[PDB]
Design a protein around this ligand. Structure first.
Ligand SMILES: OC[C@H]1O[C@@H]2O[C@H]3[C@H](O)[C@@H](O)[C@@H](O[C@H]4[C@H](O)[C@@H](O)[C@@H](O[C@H]5[C@H](O)[C@@H](O)[C@@H](O[C@H]6[C@H](O)[C@@H](O)[C@@H](O[C@H]7[C@H](O)[C@@H](O)[C@@H](O[C@H]8[C@H](O)[C@@H](O)[C@@H](O[C@H]1[C@H](O)[C@H]2O)O[C@@H]8CO)O[C@@H]7CO)O[C@@H]6CO)O[C@@H]5CO)O[C@@H]4CO)O[C@@H]3CO
Ligand SMILES: OC[C@H]1O[C@@H]2O[C@H]3[C@H](O)[C@@H](O)[C@@H](O[C@H]4[C@H](O)[C@@H](O)[C@@H](O[C@H]5[C@H](O)[C@@H](O)[C@@H](O[C@H]6[C@H](O)[C@@H](O)[C@@H](O[C@H]7[C@H](O)[C@@H](O)[C@@H](O[C@H]8[C@H](O)[C@@H](O)[C@@H](O[C@H]1[C@H](O)[C@H]2O)O[C@@H]8CO)O[C@@H]7CO)O[C@@H]6CO)O[C@@H]5CO)O[C@@H]4CO)O[C@@H]3CO
Ligand SMILES: [Ca+2]
Ligand SMILES: [Ca+2]
Ligand SMILES: [Ca+2]
Ligand SMILES: [Ca+2]
Lengths: 597, 597
């Protein structure tokens, strides 16, 4: 091995909140060496060695007096010497105060390999382990940063204000590299997507179009082809000494009064799958590495927040420190954790400000609202139930378990579950109810690329490939192009028009962003709720039945206060409310009304 | 009415905690009367009239210096005088400190009409509105107090330490009188069961056998044939002016940040059914009436606690005061409320000690554990799921939501749900798992009469009559008799023997009453947990599969600590624990081990 092979992070910033910076340096016999530097405001702490001669950890304290600039770090030993030009960048104006995504935003989610192939020439990159195959469901299809940038106007035009791509960091695996969740280099965009600079450009171009960029980060695991696995930095860098020991996924074990330590350890240290080595975040070097790397991406790429994969599969004490560190840098940031449970208590445990039975504390601002999504999908698919919507109402009534339910991400779907339209039984009328719900709940809405044209999938069990079909129009030669509208069926186009209509309308509705919610218990699968404040009321009413239903309006008078009627935003029609609300089969109305005093 | 028709309560006690006593007096023109008395320690307050000339409410303050004895209350007006000799009883030594049922107890539940007909001559009582019909699923079959008393030896012999009969108070309805839930006289045992004195004797006879008596009380509603309904004490005594307005059962509306007042009012004021007028507990006279009546039954009948029907259908502020009053009189009492929801948060809201988001305070010690019973019934029924027991494990993990989860009542079944054996798919091995679970969880176990001989029912929906078939042996001429054993199948007798074996064993296992619980995440429908303290470990392992399973014991070493083997209490077989635990298809074992250091 030659010179200094990795220096991580490769550069930093003057004026960060946390003064400490730990460089992880990798090169042959770099551990046999002594570091030295001379730069005002930067102090070199003094070595703490690791037994592996191929790694050196350099501890710096960057005082508030340190100015932007650069300086040499010199490594000496064995009659030889190595050097690295270390740069402290100036921070952009307003960096620390950056506004994270919130209730006024709507997030559009893509998988970068499956969205748009702007450059077929990077589909394969010389030296990498996997060849592209657009005909393989688990293969690389060739989507890239160029293709994403090419279609930012489309995304912004649909009414979305944030872009969340699944991970773009290098995944140099022989198979299943496309999905991004098995990182082989946390400091490098996969060259098949483009360069680090292209990713920064993605953020800058999105910002020009009024959109933030949310990065998808994995903290718990890496891919087995990560360069670390060739020469473990420490014997405990990877859980179970770098050997495959599977997790059995007992997620409640970390937050259960009756838990066995075996089960909690198995949850946070167990390997997700054989190809995903599990990081030992109880090693402070590993903790520092991940904290610094994610801060590096936020600062370097101008991100508006993060989506955090496999949330509770990371060590709990590490998560407490990681969330504390990130939010201390960026107090207005948002980060949405993926805690995949349909149990409200299990999700709520992780949100900042929660008083937990075991004293567990967290600075995590947001989580994915799997419970409420599951409830609505059940309601809209189990159409033989008399009152399926009751599950949605009851789930929502548990919002008091969350410190900030308004800051949770509610979603139409994502890359891990059945397509939204398929989950609704390919029933367009019921699908409309899901879309209206998504855009009107007291949540941050997230929508999955392709759902706006009713892409379908299998519904039973688990079939990842089926959820991740290429976006129509993202590849040269596509017969249908959803970006231009060419070749869409009337129903596909109607779906896309409705998404554009609702999302753009939502951007302009403070009452949805921060108004109150009052809902009514569903009766015979009809449901009425209101978003309200002194300036506006929005009344949503859905009839989840293949028959007309009539609802006496006396029931809703604390919200209606004698309103004789209002205009339905969907149809433009005036709807009577004086004595009864008459709903057509399988209908939903979004009635706009004056304020509530 | 002849003079004074009703005086309620009809007598009271010297030396109660609350000094106030409010008498509700009923008779023609009694409202036109003025009350007077002279007895040391007893003060008559200032009259507060109601517009109904047939009722008078008399407020007394019984000072601690009032001795047991009697005094005339004289009612004078319009040139006449009426008298009532009022008695203050001496309280039994230790009355206030009576020990309520708790974790060391096991409750046997009966419906008095359906258990044992000790006296066929009271099946019909002259004057009453319903004739007995043993062949009608919703008719009176003739079970009575004599019958219950006859078989206390049997119930105690099974290992039960508490008897909970569904209500015995008068239900003089034209149809469906048998179930007890529609009271027509809160101060009188239905004459078809026996007299008030017979009910006291049931308590005293149960106590001689080491059993407490738990009364089933309805607070929210009465029956349409209650004598009040002929001449409403006040215009607002009954919600909605004494006219039927149905509840739609929006139970979460009383505990939901997004609730409509329409819904919360509809839950607490709405009539359960047309036949069940709803008590207006916001009227202080109604609140006082119910509180005093339930205290009267406890003090008079020597009860060990209460089971409180339709818990959240009563006014919330009333419930705070009711539970405060009861627990103030009897600080060690237990009362178990029926909040019929499978959602842990909805049930936990009501338990004494809970910190609620809305500041709601309750003094209710216990609730029915519908969530956990539902979880286990799902595990046992969902035979085509790889790991159904996971529901039970995750539900239990939520016990931190309850201030005192060990005080909750866990049940095999009851009069409102499918028979325990039917819920197990009539699979004796799965039934054994449910029984072991019931008897080893950190809960107060309750068992439904008839389940000890594997009585069966329909499985789907609500089918009350199916769950309430006559106890075999309760009627002269029965050809299957569970009391004697005559006509039971080998399997039915084995079930009965197992109930006896486990319930008597449980009585003498303090580790089950107050020990810790450590459970392990179920894997492939196998589940292992331990009850433990410094004195004992009890290991439960179950294999909910029709194939053998082999579980490496390394997993459980934090509890096993090298134990090489143990004896299964159930089969009496030795069970190896050294390296692997071999479980036969559909097996459950219960292994006692010495306490951990
Ligand atoms: O970064 C990894 C991974 O993380 C994110 O999502 C995960 C989440 O954090 C986990 O909590 C969990 O969440 C739920 C899951 O989505 C639900 O499906 C279900 O999980 C169980 C299923 O009910 C059940 O089917 C069970 O049984 C097996 C599957 O049936 C079987 O197909 C196979 O699964 C393998 C996949 O088929 C295969 O494609 C491959 O998956 C990879 C993904 O394609 C890739 O995107 C990434 O996944 C991310 C995910 O995108 C994040 O958002 O890596 C995956 C791993 O290589 O490998 C699968 C094996 O894991 O085998 C399973 C045996 O388990 O599966 C699970 C029980 O484990 O409920 C869960 C919570 O209730 O998983 C998700 C998704 O991985
Ligand atoms: O004191 C009253 C009652 O209280 C206790 O249990 C109740 C609990 O507290 C409530 O929260 C609620 O719980 C849910 C219930 O378990 C679910 O089953 C469901 O209820 C719906 C039914 O599923 C649905 O079928 C329909 O019900 C109709 C019946 O199908 C129909 O036959 C008829 O019902 C008559 C009964 O057949 C008949 O036996 C008699 O019922 C009386 C009970 O036998 C008697 O024990 C008592 O019930 C107690 C219960 O034992 C307590 O432990 O009073 C009953 C009379 O009220 O008479 C019935 C007619 O009067 O009619 C009904 C429609 O009225 O609709 C229901 C409700 O929508 O959801 C409930 C809420 O989530 O109820 C239980 C009682 O089941
Ligand atoms: Ca490409
Ligand atoms: Ca992990
Ligand atoms: Ca009788
Ligand atoms: Ca009521």
């Amino acid at each position: 091995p030659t010179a200094i092979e990795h220096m991580e992070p490769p550069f930093w910033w003057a004026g960060m909140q946390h003064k400490g910076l730990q460089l992880m340096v990798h090169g042959r016999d770099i551990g046999r060496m002594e570091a030295a530097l001379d730069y005002p405001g930067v102090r070199l702490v003094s070595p703490t060695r690791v037994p592996n001669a191929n790694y050196l950890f350099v501890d710096l304290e960057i005082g508030p007096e340190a100015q932007p600039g650069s300086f040499d770090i010199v490594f000496k030993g064995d009659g030889r010497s190595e050097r690295y030009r270390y740069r402290l960048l100036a921070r952009e104006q307003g960096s620390a105060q950056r506004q994270g995504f919130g209730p006024g935003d709507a997030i559009y989610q893509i998988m970068p390999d499956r969205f748009a192939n702007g450059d077929p020439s990077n589909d394969n990159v010389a030296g990498m382990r996997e060849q592209a195959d657009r005909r393989h469901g688990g293969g690389r299809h060739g989507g890239d940063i160029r293709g994403t940038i090419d279609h930012l106007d489309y995304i912004a035009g649909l009414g979305f204000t944030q872009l969340w791509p699944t991970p773009l960091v290098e995944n140099d695996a022989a198979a299943y590299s496309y999905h991004g969740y098995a990182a082989t280099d946390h400091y490098r965009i996969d060259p098949r997507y483009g360069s680090n600079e292209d990713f920064v450009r993605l953020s800058t171009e999105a910002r020009k179009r009024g959109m933030g960029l949310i990065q998808d980060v994995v903290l718990s695991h890496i891919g087995k082809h990560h360069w670390w696995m060739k020469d473990l930095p420490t014997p405990d860098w990877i859980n179970y000494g770098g050997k495959f020991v599977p997790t059995q996924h007992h997620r409640v074990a970390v937050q259960d009064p009756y838990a066995a330590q075996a089960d909690s350890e198995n949850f946070t240290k167990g390997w997700f799958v054989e190809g995903m080595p599990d990081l030992n975040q109880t090693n402070p070097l590993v903790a520092n590495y991940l904290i610094q790397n994610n801060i590096w991406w936020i600062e370097y790429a101008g991100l508006s927040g993060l989506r955090i994969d496999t949330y509770g599969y990371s060590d709990g004490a590490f998560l407490t420190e990681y969330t504390r560190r990130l939010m201390a840098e960026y107090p207005r940031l948002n980060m949405v954790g993926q805690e995949w449970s349909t149990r409200v208590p299990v999700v709520a445990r992780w949100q900042r400000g929660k008083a937990n039975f075991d004293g567990y504390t967290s600075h995590l601002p947001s989580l994915m609202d799997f419970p409420l999504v599951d409830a609505m999908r059940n309601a809209l698919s189990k159409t033989g139930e008399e009152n399926g919507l009751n599950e949605v109402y009851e789930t929502l009534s548990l919002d008091y378990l969350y410190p900030e339910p308004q800051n949770l991400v509610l979603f139409g779907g994502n890359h891990d579950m059945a397509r939204m339209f398929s989950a609704a039984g390919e029933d367009f009328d019921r699908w409309r109810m899901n879309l209206v719900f998504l855009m009107t709940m007291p949540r941050i809405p997230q929508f999955y690329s392709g759902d706006e044209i009713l892409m379908t999938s299998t519904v039973k069990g688990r079939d990842d490939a089926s959820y991740r079909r290429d976006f129509p129009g993202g590849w040269a030669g596509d017969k249908a192009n959803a970006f231009s509208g060419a070749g869409l069926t009337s129903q596909q186009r109607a779906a896309q028009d409705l998404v554009r209509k609702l999302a753009n309308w939502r951007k302009n509705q403070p009452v949805i962003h921060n108004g109150r919610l009052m809902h009514f218990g569903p009766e015979e699968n009809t449901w009425v709720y209101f978003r309200y404040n002194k300036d506006k009321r929005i009344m949503v009413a859905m009839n989840n039945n293949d028959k007309p239903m009539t609802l006496p309006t006396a029931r809703f008078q604390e919200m209606l206060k004698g309103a004789p009627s209002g205009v339905d935003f969907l149809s433009g029609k005036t709807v009577g409310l004086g004595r009864e609300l008459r709903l057509a089969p399988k209908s939903v109305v979004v009635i706009e009304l004056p304020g509530l005093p």
